[PDB]
Design a protein around this nucleic acid. Structure first.
Lengths: 103, 97, 78, 95, 90, 83, 97, 83, 95, 103, 97, 78
DNA sequence: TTTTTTTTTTTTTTTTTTTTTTTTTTTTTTTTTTTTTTTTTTTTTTTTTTTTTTTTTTTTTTTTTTTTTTTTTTTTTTTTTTTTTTTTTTTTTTTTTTTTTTTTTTTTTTTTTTTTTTTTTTTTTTTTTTTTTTTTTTTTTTTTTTTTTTTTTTTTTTTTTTTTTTTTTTTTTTTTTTTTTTTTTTTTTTTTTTTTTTTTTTTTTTT
DNA sequence: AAAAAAAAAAAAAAAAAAAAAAAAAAAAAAAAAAAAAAAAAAAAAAAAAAAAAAAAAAAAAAAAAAAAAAAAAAAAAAAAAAAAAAAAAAAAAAAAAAAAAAAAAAAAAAAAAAAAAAAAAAAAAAAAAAAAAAAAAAAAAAAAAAAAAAAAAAAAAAAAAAAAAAAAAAAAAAAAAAAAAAAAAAAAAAAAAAAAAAAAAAAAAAA
């Protein structure tokens, strides 16, 4: 398939059909689905690697949404990317202000 | 033995930040959903996925408001919450008209 | 009815927010605020439901209503 | 019978590459699929926005390039342009 | 008295408080610092103005309300910092 | 030519003018710097957005249509030049 | 015996007024006129200051709208000293009688 | 109290100023009379609206939202005063 | 199939009253039906907006009469309100 | 026979039906349907009398929207009623500008 | 025998003023609107009722255009019309820029 | 189409409107004004036709679109 | 000022088609009871405008000239106009053909209804302490005002370049077909996380 | 300081159910050729930036006065916090019910397409003179600004009265079910009016 012919993992014909039904332009270039597939593949690779690091931190084998939330919340700019976004079984990080603890 | 004020609060705060779960059992929340739903039309069968997402979203939104008020109280040099805090928080959020 | 949100539950959620000392007045007013939140979401969801021309509400209606305000949530396969 | 679509195979492969010895919660998977669809629609809608702005009814990977440059944090954006250009050039050289 | 006179006077109208010359100067500053060889739009400059004062004054009154919520009439930078904190931008 | 220092050149009294537009009666003098900071970050964001638009337009100048594109892109809904 | 060209102050105040957004009607005479028509219709109507002011800016906006329409019709009519004929032309084309 | 000759409260300079707001450059001396007349007629329309509204408002007091109602009836929709 | 609404009988008898012998055209009665619908639409909208301006959810003759004196010209308005008073008193006489 | 009891023609029951299926509010004063019916018979009677006069003057037994447009256009107030409302194939009256007329 | 301009012109003025029927030939403008309506949606059948209503809406809009255009030409001291009149008129009305 | 409406057609239209002498550019200028108005009308028509999930723009939907543009016309069986 | 030339407007006769009554029915209304709560109703008041006067001066009205603007004429050019002939494409009736919205109804799937017990929560009550508020000093920062000038703002000028139209040949993407191959679903397993239980030590609170 | 008290983390064993992997269904994309249209390239063109300069003046910056407001401290009330206790309902799994919603078919509309007939719309050429508009003339009117003056405006204050809020009735409007037919859909009859042909007379244009 053209996926291999571009050296990617994503479904090029399927995603092109997605773009077609998208109703965004009458016609489009051929490499555009390749390009978007590549960037999405990069992003998913990054986020899954961070989640795997998190799973190492809590010493687990599978992947939990809480791991995802911890990973994203640890990095400031990634959070900025997912600003107004929230996640099922998200949770929040342990964050306590200085004066809150007793003395 | 009786514990000094604050210990329970901080311990539960820590355990909840460790925790990841809903803190409202379903049935009252569902019943509230049902009694508010028909206020536009009767006989609406509900999706469990729908209602669960509703619960989660409500919880997330209100938690956000909680931290809002916590920052307010920090700004207040006070360690107790009170309504004008949430009023300011809502105003600055701008969700209220 | 609306009192289904127990005040100890409110204390627990405050603890999730790390709140320390909580006056009673906050309870009822926040109950009202969340009620407002709920009515917004349900009216938009049913707007989409009738827009879909069905008398059974669907989770997709809920999620789309959420996105109507940029209230994006995941884990429900839109 | 409903044929709902996701990316379980694709996300599973990515899981393997980044962490060969790991599983997954289907909840996290649903989150991931919604994320995929979300980013796709955001970027594609902005590409259509450009298609109106440029008075051209066609989009190329160059359009997507400008769009992602708009949409993503700087470091991720430059990484992104790296692989996007690489993949496009690789395929164009290939067939 | 004079400070609050300035309050009412500056809240009166919608004219452009800022001056064209320095504003355009900053425009070219924040332009050339990234990319060279750009001829600007005066209309773009006008939009830059309008947006800048609009956003700033938005910050102005809402931080003012925060500071009176801080029980005081003299402002403090941390008031602005909290305001932008809730504003959701970073 | 050279570009330098205009950003700081904003007169503090102009800022105070804007503040009286903001209805603030009493003002600590320690605000002008962070106001500079926030204004410049917002405007650099928008101007870089505009530059990105223009470069994909292959045009050596700017356009108010591009300006409003960036404005709405960050979320500053405004008619008058369109809509 | 200083003499500006006929229309110099007119155009200078043209820009001044366009750059301004101040009500030109004298406020007390306007309130008196509001009272006049209110008495014409039905007496015993307490005059809210907000109502009267609202009337003031609404009337002035209606005015100015008719002014650009009439002036631009006159300019299309190869004239700039607007005379009442242009006025009823503007009224008729607006549909108002 | 009843007052007459109140359309002249918009004096000749007031009429000239309102014309300058509309961009009118040269004005004939005849304009003031017709402007007074049309202001009179439309303002009578709006106060007729207000009188009707207040008579049905369980009120004997014309108010701001009454003016709003009169405006929106006469094709004068706008923000600011409620709704 | 469908029993589409019409006012043909009522308008025809109104005709037979005002002009005892007068012909018709199908487009004329369609005009009449649409006109009556429009009258209902505008009168009802104004009446409801008035009823809510003074904070009442009961559709009384009071707000419809105030709306019609807002809308109809003096002659038409006064004649209409007199007709309404006559008809309501007639019905209240009967049951 | 509510209409006969109210002394009109248009159906008070049906007009009340159209009222409350207009979903305007919950409860409704009973005088509203009767009053609305009455004002409608008044207006249709007035327009119909004008149309009949125009038709018979036109030597036309049948009513035509030419007659209706004649009636509306002759009456300036009835024109005001149909301000933003136009007539179906009514047509324009002969309204020629003065200068365009032959000398 | 030759007839000078104006006489038969005014005869057609009055004949078309008394007449109301469609002067635009039905099928060509029908094709026009069929192709225009096709620009957005496909597989569109077309019932003649909406077709005729569309034609009449267009024609009423057009006749408003002509009457106001002639009025504008009167206002501009002319009896021949050039397009400046239409932009002026529609801008006064408020539709165009 | 736009020449399925011809110059003599524009003449007949202008005679109906009382116009006497016409410029050439008037023809195409008015043709374009017709184009834009008709296109806006049909855009509302179709949006609320397939909004009401219909393959064909109904005359009643036309009535709605025109009444939205304030150009109400009677005689369409509402 | 008089006379010709259509050209329209008017009257008779045919027909046709549109209107109008009469038949069918079913989909809508009336009546009656019952309920019930919104809407009114009465009191309190309170504020909220109305009512006036002084003090400051601001806005309006007057006047003169000059001047500059609209209007009028004439002359030009071409701008439309008009006529007869040719072109043409409309539109109209009946026939094909599609096709295409709508609608029923089996199934099927999915939601809503009961039970219960029972437990883990909620609720409640009683100390209390830390938490909030409130009150005093004070000092210190934040401010206005004057003067100086260093600054911005305006208008030409000249450039120039920088966008912008059009035209051609190009890519190149769209369309339809075949084939072939992909993604999803079920079942099974196992393989993990979960639960519970014990042990450590680590702090909070008391001595 | 020092030690006990929960408490909570660390480790470990049972256990269960989730993840996932093989096979089949199927549904859809790669590949293929034809082509028809958007865009590229480019040359010209003209519109706007922009670079710079003097002239006018205004905004601001520093210094000094000054003053109020924020912050720190003291101190007391109390009210959430933190114990105890009793109580009840959330739930979780099973059993029940019932119905929301949909594919295949089906009946029925609803457009669309063509033959082609003829038939008047539209086209064009070609004459041609009138009107749009410039050049120029006549003129008149209104705008500018110094004076004088009317009264608006800013600011305080007095009162009575509109109506807003607080309890409370009534009454008015709604809900439901049997009784009962009404307002629309069809058939057929008939007569109102266009069709057609022509006559009377009156604007149009030439002398």
């Amino acid at each position: 398939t053209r996926s291999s012919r571009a050296g990617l993992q994503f479904p090029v014909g399927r995603v092109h059909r997605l773009l077609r039904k998208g109703n965004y332009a009458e016609r489009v270039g051929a490499g555009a689905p390749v390009y978007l597939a590549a960037v999405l593949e990069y992003l998913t690779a990054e986020i899954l690697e961070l989640a795997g690091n998190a799973a190492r931190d809590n010493k687990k084998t599978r992947i939990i949404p809480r791991h995802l939330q911890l990973a994203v919340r640890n990095d400031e700019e990634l959070n900025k990317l997912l600003g107004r976004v929230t996640i099922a079984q998200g949770g929040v990080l342990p964050n306590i202000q200085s004066v809150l603890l007793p003395k | 033995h009786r514990y000094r004020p604050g210990t329970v609060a901080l311990r539960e705060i820590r355990r909840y930040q460790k925790s990841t779960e809903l803190l409202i059992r379903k049935l009252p929340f569902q019943r509230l959903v049902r009694e508010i739903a028909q206020d536009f039309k009767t006989d609406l069968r509900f999706q469990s996925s729908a209602v669960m997402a509703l619960q989660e979203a409500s919880e997330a939104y209100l938690v956000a408001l909680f931290e809002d008020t916590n920052l307010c109280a920090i700004h207040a040099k006070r360690v107790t919450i009170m309504p004008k805090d949430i009023q300011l928080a809502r105003r600055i959020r701008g969700e209220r008209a | 009815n609306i009192q289904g949100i127990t005040k100890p539950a409110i204390r627990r959620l405050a603890r999730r927010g790390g709140v320390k000392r909580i006056s009673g007045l906050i309870y009822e007013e926040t109950r009202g605020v969340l009620k407002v939140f709920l009515e917004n979401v349900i009216r938009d969801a049913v707007t989409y439901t009738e827009h879909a021309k069905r008398k059974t509400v669907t989770a997709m209606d809920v999620v789309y209503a959420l996105k109507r305000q940029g209230r994006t949530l995941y884990g429900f396969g839109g | 019978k409903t044929r709902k679509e996701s990316y379980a195979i694709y996300v599973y492969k990515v899981l393997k590459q980044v962490h060969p010895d790991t599983g997954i919660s289907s909840k996290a998977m649903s989150i991931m699929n919604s994320f995929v669809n979300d980013v796709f629609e955001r970027i594609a809608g902005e590409a259509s926005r450009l298609a109106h702005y440029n008075k051209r009814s066609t989009i190329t990977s160059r359009e997507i390039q400008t769009a992602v440059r708009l949409l993503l944090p700087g470091e991720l954006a430059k990484h992104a342009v790296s692989e996007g250009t690489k993949a496009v050039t690789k395929y164009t050289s290939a067939k």
